[PDB]
Each structure stands twice: as C-alpha cells, then as structure tokens.
C-alpha cells in the first residue's frame, strides 16, 4: 500500500507468500530398542498379557 | 520412508521442540507482530519471548541456522526464496506446508 | 555372547554345592555350550535348565536368538528385493 | 590341582595384562580423520602426513548417556578392576586354603569381567557408528576370551574342592 | 527431481538385555547360595 | 536326525560326542542359512514382478 | 479442522487364543464334573 | 495356610477395586478432541484445558458388532462381575469349610475374569483404531495381573486341600 501510493504497479507477475523452510529429513540413528519397532507397543503389551 | 516433523503452520504452533525464527527486521516480522489469527497469535507470542532469540540478522544466517540445527530450527521466509534455496547445493533444506 | 552365555549357564547350574547333594543336572561346560549352540540354531531337543537362574539365562538367550535370526532373514529379503 | 592353579594364575595374569594394554594403548581403530589416523579410547594420532606422530585427545562431546558412557570408558576399566580383584582372590586362596569361597569369588569376578568387556565392546562400536580395527581392540577381545576360560577353571576348582570335602 | 547390512547399533538393545539377564541370573544364584549357606551355618 | 534337522522339526536323539556334535552343529548352521535364503528369495519373488 | 503393525491387524488371533483358552477350561471342567458325579454314585 | 487365605482375599479385593475404579474413571486415553487436549474413558471425554476445562461429554460410539461391544463395555463389566463372584466364593468358603469345590469355583472365576479383561483391552484399543494411555488403563492391566495371580493361588489352595484330604 505504501509503495502503491507513489508508483503504479502492474498485476503480479509472480505470486508468493510466507513459508516454512526446514532441514531435509534424513535417516535417524537407530534407537537402542529399535528392534521392537516392527510391532506396535500395544501388540507387545497384549503378547505379555 | 522419511516423514517430516512439520507439515503446516499449526504443526509448528502446537509443538515446542522445534524452534522457528524470521529476520530481525522484515516484512515477516511485522506480519507476525500485527497478525490477528489465533495460530499466528500463538506463534508471535512464542517467537517474541523465545530465549535465546530466534530472529536472525540476514536470510543467509537463517538458512545456515536451519542447516546446522539438525532439524531443530525452522525458518519463515518468502516462498520464492525458499524454493530457490531448496534447489541449490548442498540441497539439505526444503519447503513445508502452504 | 555365545561364549558368555554358555559360561554363565554352566556357572549358575553347577557351582553351588547345596544342589550336588551324581551331578544335580546335565549342564557342564560342554553341555552348556551344546545347549547354547542348539538354542541359537533353534534346534535343540536335548535338555533345558530347571533352576530359576538357568531358566533366566535360557530365556534371555532365546529372546536374543529370536530377534537376531528374524533380523537376518528380514535383511536378506530386503537385499534381494532391492536388487 | 597344581596344574589347574598354575593355569588359572597364568590365564588371569594374561587377561589382566591384555586388558590393561588394550585400555592404555591407542590402536583400537584406523580411520580417516585429524589424514589417516589411529585412535584408541582416549587419543587420535596421525600415522601419515606432516603431522605424523601428533596425538590429540578425542573430543567425545539417550544419546547423551551413550556418549558419556563411551567417554568415561567405565566398562573397560571396570573389566580391568574385576580382573585385578579376581587375581587378588586367586592369590589369597593360597594363604587361606580352608576358605573355599575365595575360589568362587575369583570365578565370579572373572565371569563378571568378561561380561563388562562385552558391554564395553558393544558401547565402543555403537559410539563409533554414530575403517578397520587395530591390535588393541583384539587384545581386549582376547582378554575377554581368556577371562571366561579362567572363570570356568576357577568354578571347576571350586566344584572339585567341595566334592573332595564331601568324600 | 524429488525422485545396507544392518549394524550393531540396530540390535544393541537386545545385547544389553542379554547381558542384563546374565547378570540377573548370576545375582539370583548367588543370593540363593548365600541364603542356603547361612541356613546351613545356623543349623 | 539329518532330515528332522533340515526341516527344523526337533529331534528324538542328539549326538553326545565331540565329533557327532561338530557334525550336528555344522548341519544346523547349513540348515539355518539355506532356509533363510529360501524364504528371503521367495519374498523377493512375490514382492517384485 | 484440517509403519509399525497395529493391534487391529492381529486382533483375530488374540480372539482365537482367548476362545481356545475358554474352550479348554470348559472341557476340563466338564470332565471333572462327569468324574465327580460318577464318584458320588459309587 | 491362613496366610494363603489372607493373600487370596487381599488380592481379590485389590483386583476388584482396581477394575471398578478403571471402569468408573475417565483417564483411559489422552488425545485431542472437542481442537483441545482431552482425557477420555469408557463413557465420557473431558477437556484437560482451554475455556471448557472440566467439561465432560458422553462418547458417541456410533464393523457394527465391534462398535456395539465397545459401546456396551460388556467385557470390562463382566470382568468386574466375575471378580465380585470370586470374592463371594472366597468369603463363603469360610463358612463351608468342608465344601472344597467352592475354592475351585473362586479360582475359576478369577481366571475367567482375567481372560475377560484381556478381551476388553483388545476391543478397546481396536475400537480406537477406527495419543497416550492414562492411569485407568493401567489400573485395568494391574487388575488383570492380580486376578491371574489370585486365581493361581486359589487353584493351589484347592489342590492342597484335596492332597490333605487324600492323606
């Protein structure tokens, strides 16, 4: 608005906005107990029961 | 299959493990300060009272902070610049959400 | 881990004189090594520990064997599928 | 019996010496770093280039717990301590030939030293993951094997002593 | 465009569990032996 | 004994001598590797056409 | 507003297991009742 | 002997009370709903914070059979009923000391109760598929464990009674 009050703007030749930039997700170091990952925690609990 | 932690604005708003920041002085800063939308209200509240300060001197500093933070920092910036940086080496950053 | 498990099984099975009162069981060092090898291969039919401590050792060895062998098969399948 | 005691003492000394050398020396791993270097539990030394022979303390610093346990090297040192205690028990057994629980204590110490050696090896390798292995790593492994064999010998000696008492 | 051998770190937890179980078995056996020894001494 | 070991179906008797136990253990290792390879390659076949 | 295997994938086998346990208890108790009745009438 | 009666009665009361509290309370699952963080039980869901904090709302439970079973909560309630009947059998065994079949009955009830518990859990979690777990869920789990232990005790006591009678 401030600029438009002193100069004439054409229509937007390219539209943009505010966006979020994050580091690309990468392979995570396996956890100590990652060998339980294939089954859900509920499966293990019900197996014990 | 690698899944990003953040997928939208509200995802950033909900969590607190990942910090986010903008330029110290720029259009994004005023947009967040002056906003009237609850999600951006809570983002502005988090950002203004963030210790240490999440704001950066320049865009390059924000990009470097994102790259070196091991995914614990998210930079809010123009979509065009975000896309451009995403397509440049070392190709370790990407744009999320709308 | 195989060596350690076999040694600990022998120790907990045979050390105490209050059970000798012929040996209390069949778990010498040689028989402990045989039991551990068969357990890892998932083949043993011969003897299992009867004491609480021997059964703890056997159970943890069994869990280790299960996880390791499932991991081997799964990673081999992954190799072949990816190629 | 004399042969068994001689073997137990020699094996205990061998395992203790091997573990002590493995902990003290700096040839656990060969890898590229600061350019081809050999590193132990504490130091990294360049074996080629201008700075050949220059050693630098390793910069160690759930993940924090692993890094702390690796930096302290609690488990290799605990294995050395347990081997020393087992050797002390074996030595003291001669002075007190009627107290048969000293042999049992020595056997327990040797088995526990082997177990802590296993834990230390696993922790070291896992911390490194986050190349090649040198002669001190295999000194530690050989120490583990000898410690387990000596523990088996000590337990056998305890059993034989109690069998003789029964008969 | 937007378009292997599993290591010890993948299975470290099961090794820790195994060694902990070995230690627990040793402790249980030793506790029972000590209890029986004191009982024998008293009797 | 060899057939039961290969099929992973237990055993009536097991060798008690050092040499018999060497034979049994090496046969068990062979069986483990071969059966795992069969299952893995069958999975690879069924996954990718 | 707008990996792991879940228990819903393997719920049927849990149901089968618990049903089999109930059936086993039922069979054992029926046999016990029959034998006890036979004992009483003798 | 009396120690076994005491343990069985105490465990029966503990399991019954734990199951009743778990069925009655609302802290089974922590999730997000009506948006806002909420804690929900078998019947009600309440808001943990926001402008409606403290307000509770009946859960809208509507395979049709799974939905009906989950909504009725037939299996947790059946477990509570079976625990009550087992406690009644234990109490009655005091007055009729020569009727051993009461003790057996008690054991059976407890075992059955445990099994019912299992099914309930399996249903509950399954119904959630179509977060975190609160202390009511773990109260139910502990109730299952104690019920199984008390059933084992009661069966052992029946066996001991019949062995004494046999001699």
Residue numbers in the entry:
A (entry chain D): 485 to 533
B (entry chain D): 632 to 729
C (entry chain A): 534 to 554, 570 to 631
D (entry chain Z): 6 to 39, 57 to 83, 94 to 162, 174 to 210
E (entry chain D): 779 to 781, 789 to 828
F (entry chain B): 583 to 631
G (entry chain C): 779 to 780, 789 to 828
H (entry chain Y): 6 to 39, 56 to 83, 95 to 162, 174 to 210
Reproduce passages from the article.
GluA3, a subtype strongly associated with disease, functions as both a fast-transmitting Ca2+-permeable AMPAR at sensory synapses, and as a Ca2+-impermeable receptor at cortical synapses. Here we present cryo-electron microscopy structures of the Ca2+-permeable GluA3 homomer, which substantially diverges from other AMPARs. The GluA3 extracellular domain tiers (N-terminal domain (NTD) and ligand-binding domain (LBD)) are closely coupled throughout gating states, creating interfaces that impact signalling and contain human disease-associated mutations. Central to this architecture is a stacking interaction between two arginine residues (Arg163) in the NTD dimer interface, trapping a unique NTD dimer conformation that enables close contacts with the LBD.
GluA3-G–TARP-γ2 determined in the apo state diverges from existing AMPAR structures in its sequence-diverse NTD tier. We constructed a double-upright GluA3-G–TARP-γ2 receptor to a resolution of 2.5–3 Å. We also observed selective interaction of the extracellular TARP β1 loop with the B/D LBDs, while the other TARP pair targets the A/C KGK motif40 through their β4 loop. These contacts are conserved in apo and active GluA3.
